[PDB]
Amino acid sequence: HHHMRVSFMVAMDENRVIGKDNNLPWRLPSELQYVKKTTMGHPLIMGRKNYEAIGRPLPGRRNIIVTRNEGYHVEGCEVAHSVEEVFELCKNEEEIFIFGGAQIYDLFLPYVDKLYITKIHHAFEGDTFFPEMDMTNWKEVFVEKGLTDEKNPYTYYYHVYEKQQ
Numbered sequence: 001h002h003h004m005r006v007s008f009m010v011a012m013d014e015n016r017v018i019g020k021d022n023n024l025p026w027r028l029p030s031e032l033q034y035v036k037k038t039t040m041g042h043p044l045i046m047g048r049k050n051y052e053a054i055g056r057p058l059p060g061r062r063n064i065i066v067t068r069n070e071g072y073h074v075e076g077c078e079v080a081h082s083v084e085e086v087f088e089l090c091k092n093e094e095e096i097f098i099f100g101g102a103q104i105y106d107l108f109l110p111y112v113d114k115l116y117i118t119k120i121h122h123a124f125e126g127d128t129f130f131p132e133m134d135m136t137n138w139k140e141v142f143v144e145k146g147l148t149d150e151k152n153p154y155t156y157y158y159h160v161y162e163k164q165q
């Protein structure tokens with residue numbers, strides 16, 4: 001029924017860890033630059049917890065916060081309370097990025113068409129996980145090694161998968 005491309009944007013470790021203590025377990029400035037480049041000019045759909053950890057509206061993008069709180073407001077941001085409300089807000093958009101965290105990934109999992117996933121080759125301590133995904137009828141359309149240096153101290157790869165069905 002929806003017309004926009006539903007893309008996931010996520011970075012996870014070897015065990016699907018995405019978060020620890022309501023924050024990111026790693027610091028990879030180069031990976032963040034890839035995120036900014038890939039998502040700029042497109043709506044970011046964020047779970048309420050993710051948004052508050054980010055702490056500010058991200059410029060040059062529609063920021064959409066997902067919450068059950070019908071009295072929730074943030075200046076410079078739009079608020080949605082369900083998948084269907086997000087779809088109404090984004091009905092004329094070309095592509096939207098589901099930006100996390102885990103609850104919001106779970107929520108939009110039945111609808112994802114495209115996966116931008118950074119895989120970090122390290123096993124972090126964590127408490128929040130990217131959901132398991134059946135990749136049947138998906139194909140990898142892009143893969144590239146991320147920049148590892150003194151500022152980016154882990155080995156990681158950018159992957160993009162597209163759903164065929």
Ligand SMILES: NC(=O)c1ccc[n+]([C@@H]2O[C@H](COP(=O)([O-])OP(=O)(O)OC[C@H]3O[C@@H](n4cnc5c(N)ncnc54)[C@H](OP(=O)(O)O)[C@@H]3O)[C@@H](O)[C@H]2O)c1
Pocket residue numbers: 009010011012017018019020021022023024046047048049050051053066067068069080081082083099100101102103104105107128
């Ligand atoms: N590495 C990455 O790529 C990445 C990306 C994003 C986030 N993260 C990490 O992931 C963690 C946060 O993930 P999380 O799962 O704890 O939180 P989250 O998904 O970001 O937010 C959870 C909140 O979303 C709202 N929500 C959940 N289900 C809903 C529904 N069905 N309808 C309407 N609203 C709903 C609720 O807000 P209310 O309580 O206000 O009702 C809930 O408390 C953090 O540690 C963050 O750093 C990592």
Ligand SMILES: CCc1nc(N)nc(N)c1C#CCc1cc(-c2ccccc2)ccc1OC
Pocket residue numbers: 009010011023024031032035036050053054058099100116117118
């Ligand atoms: C940067 C890892 C990351 N990588 C990927 N591939 N997907 C993601 N969804 C996230 C994530 C995240 C959550 C997150 C994002 C930004 C941010 C800041 C400016 C511009 C864009 C994003 C800041 C803090 C933050 O958590 C404290």
